[PDB]
Amino acid sequence: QNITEEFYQSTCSAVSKGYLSALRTGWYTSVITIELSNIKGTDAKVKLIKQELDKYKNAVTELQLLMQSTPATFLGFLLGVGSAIASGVAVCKVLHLEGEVNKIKSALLSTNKAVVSLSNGVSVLTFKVLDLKNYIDKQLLPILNCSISNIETVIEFQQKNNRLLEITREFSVNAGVTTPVSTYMLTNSELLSLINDMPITNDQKKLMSNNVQIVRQQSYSIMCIIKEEVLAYVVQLPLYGVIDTPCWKLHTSPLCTTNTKEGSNICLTRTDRGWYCDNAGSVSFFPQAETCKVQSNRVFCDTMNSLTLPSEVNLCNVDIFNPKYDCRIMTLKTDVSSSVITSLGAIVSCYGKTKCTASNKNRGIIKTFSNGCDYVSNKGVDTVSVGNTLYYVNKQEGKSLYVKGEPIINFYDPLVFPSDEFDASISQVNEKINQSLAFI
């Protein structure tokens, strides 16, 4: 779409706008099931099937060993704390009630996909993706009560047993909870049909179908129960209750004075960088922008990694001194040079004797940054160098706008400025400055 950026010279920050939201807000719990079999002149083929049957016994013995265990799994320190799989573990706990697997075992008699009402009222979508009991009771039990010369029986059993062996492996090195959800746990044809039957909007169906590889990354596979010849595990799928609302990304870098004595210098950095998305009259703020996933101009975030802020937080980009929101800063003296590759350019904080440049593949250096905080758009720029570090800029097409302004750090007297404030605000600094002045 129309991706645009604004660099604010006054605050050493940039906003990339034009994105669309797809926020994980809820969970959908489904029960995936695998129908198991309960079973007990020696040539080579009977030996091979006993070897392949030993694996089936080993995997079943191991999954019972996992089922022994009740399932367990800048401003980010302000976030809350919650259990990601608490919604799926509660469903798993229900499946441990007597007759509850028997309800699923019974409802999955005439079909593979079914909606089952549990004792707690959760309407779950149950799946039978593999029937090993049918294969063992039809093709392998009569041939063992000890001679077969159809080698295709060995390969067919190897192929049919393979998915079970691998699902068991994934659960073994992951304490019974896996993420992302592999194609062994749930193939694409199973996932796409699971989406079509999901109690979601047609917009959410189209969104999840065109972005299945994100659904996998945001989903959990929880090993649940082995009981009554049934292997059941829970797949916890994302619900995107917020879709196509505006998102924007805020990039910040340190803003420092460039005086000759580096000990008479003070710094200032906006701490509110991350993803911002309009959401229900407020703004969902994602302080660790690494937890969000971007597909073109769509951004996938999980609300568990967010803060719900007033919409007035956006005024901090236009007027960081506005009275409506107390914009958050830090005053640690971070007089080292760095760069931040934005959506359509690069913020460069250049301090000291550092060589900071932006170059082109064939043309050469096209901008040399002086001390302070500056910005260059990706137009004609291929890389950015800061000291010995080379950064590649994004070659995405979009318009950058440079908002000239006086660096706000110049408005402060270094002799009273409270350096080393890990997390403060415009008002806390002003409060601390007025106190230190009254002592004079």
Place this chain on the structure above:
Amino acid sequence: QNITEEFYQSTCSAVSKGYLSALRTGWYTSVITIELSNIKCNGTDAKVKLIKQELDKYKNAVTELQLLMQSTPATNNRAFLGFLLGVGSAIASGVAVCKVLHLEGEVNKIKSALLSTNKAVVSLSNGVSVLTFKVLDLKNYIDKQLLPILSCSISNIETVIEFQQKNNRLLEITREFSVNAGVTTPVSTYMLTNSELLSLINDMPITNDQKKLMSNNVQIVRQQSYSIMCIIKEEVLAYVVQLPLYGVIDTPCWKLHTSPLCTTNTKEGSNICLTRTDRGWYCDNAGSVSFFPQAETCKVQSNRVFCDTMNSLTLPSEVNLCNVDIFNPKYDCRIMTLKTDVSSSVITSLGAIVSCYGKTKCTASNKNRGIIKTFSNGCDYVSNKGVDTVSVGNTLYYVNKQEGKSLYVKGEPIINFYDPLVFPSDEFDASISQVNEKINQSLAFI
């Protein structure tokens, strides 16, 4: 057991108690071995063609493990309170065994003891009595079933399929070591199968309590174990499986949940906050308390907690008084004073702490009935009894449906005891006494 929770309204914190400890204090290093075959025909059919392809994989796997072993095993070393932790190598005990196996005649000592059996106890030259395992004998299979066929031909397809099955474990063990620089964790079923691990545990020189504990929680043992690629020499592939030893068992553990405690005045610039910074796992250990500040390093199975003491701080047992009397003179309880006047929730073991500030909508809902509690400004708590979800702003939290009793300890929020005009806001890691000292200075200035 009986897991219980206490919410302390005065400090906006909760303690989940009733747990039993299983803290890693030692290591057991075992040597896993695979006896290799030393191998060096034009006229072929299709079955020998498949065996030639599968034999190229065996050669490539051996060639790669030799390339990986070229590098002495390597680790990535350092130099809420996690920056306070120490720095040590987790696999240092297993690397010492690898160093011994590179001594001349040391691999041959293992080769001899695993000649007539698959499991054996070997005393190394450094005095370590290791439990050695021969989990795969490709030398016997290749020299008996594949060497005579090597101008050459066979039409027995069952040898091709059996060879693919026997060679697979080597190929998968090799893959895991290649994408993990020779050190893997957790230990996979290829590195050590479930039946081999259970028998390895049964022969281990430990008490029956630890045997029953490790046996009933093998999938935890895997995650807390390391597989260290060691040596290929004299037709032997050897790697070390480093297993945890739980020297602290069945001592009391409890989890501390904290959330910001702020004043709820109308003007958001007159509001001050306070948060207990000591959250994490606490376990009684040897007259002290092992404190695990990164509560992600501990793994909980029902009412048992598995932690690694390498990720702990050793505190006096008086640190527990901070939950009863945060102003006690015996321990200086640690708080922070950053003005964190945003709403958030903390999902505990048996409930939810809700810090609601400003204009944020904080509610607690039921499975199907909907909102059953609306939180007002301040710090409150709801039990998981009858509650399924918690909403704070646009964030929906699911509570844990574990069964246990919650106890609400009513008390005056201690943030109300401070004058906002002298309160030292923005203290990243301070204590009750450090704050009190800073207030007397700003008051003595009047």
Place this chain on the structure above:
Amino acid sequence: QNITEEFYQSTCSAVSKGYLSALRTGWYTSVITIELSNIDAKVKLIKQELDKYKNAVTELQLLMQSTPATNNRAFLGFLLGVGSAIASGVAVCKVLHLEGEVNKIKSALLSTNKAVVSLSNGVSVLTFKVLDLKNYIDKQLLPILSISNIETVIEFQQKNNRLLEITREFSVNAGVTTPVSTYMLTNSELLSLINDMPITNDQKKLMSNNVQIVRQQSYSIMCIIKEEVLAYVVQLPLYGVIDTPCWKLHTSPLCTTNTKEGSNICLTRTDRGWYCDNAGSVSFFPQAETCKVQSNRVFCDTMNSLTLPSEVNLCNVDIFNPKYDCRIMTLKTDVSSSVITSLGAIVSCYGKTKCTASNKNRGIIKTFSNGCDYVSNKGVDTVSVGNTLYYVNKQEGKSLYVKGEPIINFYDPLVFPSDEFDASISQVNEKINQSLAFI
């Protein structure tokens, strides 16, 4: 090599020197290709195994639907910059979507498996054909469309395995994997990829002798499925800085040891990590876990570094020097800990903690008193601090103990600014002159 250590008693820090640098400064992008085919009981196995190939290709098309995506940001690790590691390899992915660009590779990989192709953007890439499924399916599986030659089923199973496995790795990694697996690039393919690479023989010898490190620092980016070609990019590191001196700085908290633990003040150097000489400056790596050590060589990615003046080294010799403002923090961290260094251990013992250094067979050989001290690994096997047991490195090297007055003793506890998350020697002196002027 000759690893040496110095412990500075005055600042509770130790420097391990003698290492050699190998710093990632550039990237080599190569295009790996897989030529695809467009399409009783024994055919049942062939139909099932053929469905896997169709589904795997169907999935890669579903994965390729998404231009590769990254998780970018917006002790001092928060001071680092922000950049995309795979941006150079993503540029190749963008080129391969241009018309006629795949056919250029398809043409160059007609008579051989390895070829150098000049792309439309001017990048001379080394292209590889590691699997030809088009040949197998159009020659052995198209004519059967029954056959009861079971060796055809197994041969297809063996040839299809790598494709299915490459698809799996991309599915649980959003199309970008690291390290690069043997499926993405086998060891013989990587060794030959290095040998045909336009680099010096020294870097070839370096990369060849440390391939499992090259894998960890390399990325595999899924690119395109088009015109019967599956193409992905393997992004390999180039080490532009080699054999310059590196050293590691270990720090631990330095506190006073008075009787009342509330009259005690602490001080910790925050500049711990890896330091390597680089282009007249010093590349500083604050999270030393991002570096990988092989014997005495240090492999780091400059994307995780800060470029500091070379005078930063004076902080180890004279922390009060005027040339560099040495960085400290003053949080009251009066808990005991140990730091295992290259040749010894730093021990910060405070309060009532039992801190000892023991031998395997001899027992306790040193008991640490309150404060910050050091023991060399010579004759020492373990260190105990409270309930935590640390193993020392048994590496051979000499440690040098630099005796000095702990600098925390130079401060008046009544004016010392405790709770400074990241300050410096001069910032602390500045705050004390102010707090004294108020008296």
